[PDB]
Amino acid sequence: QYPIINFTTAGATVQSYTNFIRAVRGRLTTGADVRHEIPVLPNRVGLPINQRFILVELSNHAELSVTLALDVTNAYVVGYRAGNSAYFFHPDNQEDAEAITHLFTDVQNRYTFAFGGNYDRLEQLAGNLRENIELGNGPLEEAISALYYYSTGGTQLPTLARSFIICIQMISEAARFQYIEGEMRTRIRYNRRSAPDPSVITLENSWGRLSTAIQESNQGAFASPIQLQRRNGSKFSVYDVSILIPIIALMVYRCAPPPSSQF
Ligand SMILES: Nc1nc2nc(C(=O)N[C@@H](Cc3ccc(O)cc3)C(=O)O)cnc2c(=O)[nH]1
Ligand SMILES: Nc1nc2nc(C(=O)N[C@@H](Cc3ccc(O)cc3)C(=O)O)cnc2c(=O)[nH]1
């Protein structure tokens, strides 16, 4: 029922990863909502359940597969399937809890984690912050295996949390930001794993605020500047949507777009 996008870390290249992220974005957004050349994800309000999720099937060189479920309203990884078991993060509300009952319905064993899936909680469980977790094709390859082996006792909870952190950034954050996609492309091109620099972290942390600022902007101009960080940690002030067009690929729906003003 829900659309499936396939990616493998086995012999992954810049092009195969680029194709993957493009395909994810195409299934996340409908094309209905584009503001200042930036697509907006579907509004949660009134969105039919048959349109709520996409599936990302990850394979690796170890010949293992896991399937991540992503909420189209926010690109959030809500859970995953590995073989005969599915695992869902603790839902943040009642209707998100109802929504996940529509996923992996044929699976033998259904589990809801007692913990939520936000970075704060996952970092706590991993025993490491995002700034100290390596990203790249190698980490993703290993993350797929770790997710796969969780149900049989092979994967410690900190490793599982770390693996989620890897998946979320290389899939969801890359889909949200061309900039983060670009950083992942670089790691793949050279087969060199590295932890995300402050430009990556601050973009991830600011996605909600950037989405709202763009959507509330006066003809693209922010009422309040947003402070980001560069690769070297130095401050970068954002005053306008214009500078974000090459950086942000998708926004979360925050408000209705204002009417055009006919001059
Ligand atoms: N499973 C899953 N989890 C996710 N979790 C986050 C996440 O935790 N974002 C943070 C950003 C933030 C962090 C710290 C701050 O001080 C401020 C903002 C937030 O909204 O709280 C983002 N994306 C996903 C995602 O796609 N899938
Ligand atoms: N399906 C689903 N969605 C969820 N979405 C959030 C969440 O943080 N939502 C934000 C949107 C947002 C997302 C990522 C960010 O980095 C920043 C903002 C909000 O409601 O404003 C937390 N949990 C869940 C969850 O369990 N299940």
Tell me the CA distances in angstroms from 3 to 28, 37, 48, one per residue in order.
10, 25, 15
How far, in Å, CA of 166 to CA of 10, rounded?
A: 16
Asked if 76 and 103 count as a contact pair (C-beta separation under 8 A), the reply is no
Full domain range(s) for residue 72:
4-190
How far, in Å, CA of 113 to CA of 91, rounded?
A: 9
How far, in Å, CA of 206 to CA of 193, rounded?
A: 24
How far, in Å, CA of 173 to CA of 161, rounded?
A: 16
In a domain, 104, yes or no: yes
In a domain, 63, yes or no: yes
Q: What are the two backbone dihedrals, phi and then psi, of residue 248, each rounded to the nearest 5 degrees? A: -105, 125
Residue type, 205: N
User: Resolution in angstroms for this experimental structure?
Assistant: 1.5
Asked if 86 and 105 count as a contact pair (C-beta separation under 8 A), the reply is no
In a domain, 213, yes or no: no
In a domain, 154, yes or no: yes
**CATH code, domain carrying 15:** 3.40.420.10
Q: What are the two backbone dihedrals, phi and then psi, of residue 164, each rounded to the nearest 5 degrees? A: -60, -45
In a domain, 128, yes or no: yes
In a domain, 162, yes or no: yes
Q: Are strands 109-112 and 34-35 parallel, antiparallel or unpaired?
A: unpaired
Binding site as annotated, residues for a carbohydrate: 4-6, 11, 46, 137-142, 191-193
CA of 10 to the centre of ligand 2 (A): 30
CA of 76 to the centre of ligand 2 (A): 6
* Residues having CB within 6 Å of any atom of ligand 2: 71, 74, 76, 78, 89, 91-92, 96, 116-118, 207-208, 252
Q: Are strands 77-82 and 65-71 parallel, antiparallel or unpaired?
A: antiparallel
Catalytic residue flag (residue 181): no
Q: How many CB atoms lie within 10 A of CB 112?
A: 14
Query: CA gyration radius for the chain?
Result: 18
Strand partners of residue 133: none
As a three-state string, the secondary structure of 177-232 is EHHHHHHHHHHHHHCCCECCCHHHHHHHHHHHHHHHHHHHCECCEEEEEEEEECCC
* Residues having CB within 6 Å of any atom of ligand 1: 75-77, 89, 117-119, 168, 172, 204-205, 208
Locate all alpha helices (DSSP H) within the chain, ordered by sequence: 14-28, 94-100, 119-126, 137-148, 157-167, 174-176, 178-190, 198-216
Strand partners of residue 87: 80, 111
Catalytic residue flag (residue 119): yes
Torsional sign, CA 24, 28, 31, 37: negative
Q: Is 16 exposed, middle or buried (0-12, 13-18, 19+ CB in 10 A)?
A: middle
Tell me the CA distances in angstroms from 240 to 83, 211, 213, 220, 224, one per residue in order.
46, 12, 9, 6, 10
Tokens of 154: 């092979």
Strand partners of residue 88: 79, 112
Catalytic residue flag (residue 134): no
Catalytic residue flag (residue 190): no
Name the domain count of the chain: 1
Residue corresponding to tokens 């793949």: 188
How far, in Å, CA of 102 to CA of 99, rounded?
A: 6
In a domain, 232, yes or no: no
Asked if 40 and 130 count as a contact pair (C-beta separation under 8 A), the reply is no
Asked if 67 and 55 count as a contact pair (C-beta separation under 8 A), the reply is yes
Of the candidates 255, 93, 80, which has an alpha carbon nearest to the alpha carbon of residue 171?
80
How far, in Å, CA of 131 to CA of 18, rounded?
A: 24
Tokens of 144: 């797929």
Q: How many residues does the chain have?
A: 263
Torsional sign, CA 60, 78, 165, 208: positive
Run of H or E residues at 165:
helix 157-167
How far, in Å, CA of 181 to CA of 18, rounded?
A: 8
Query: Which ligand has the shortest distance to the CA of 41?
Result: 2
Tell me the CA distances in angstroms from 229 to 52, 212, 247, one per residue in order.
33, 19, 13
Residue type, 211: S
In a domain, 42, yes or no: yes
Rounded to whole angstroms, the maximal C-alpha distance in the chain is: 65
Strand partners of residue 39: 34
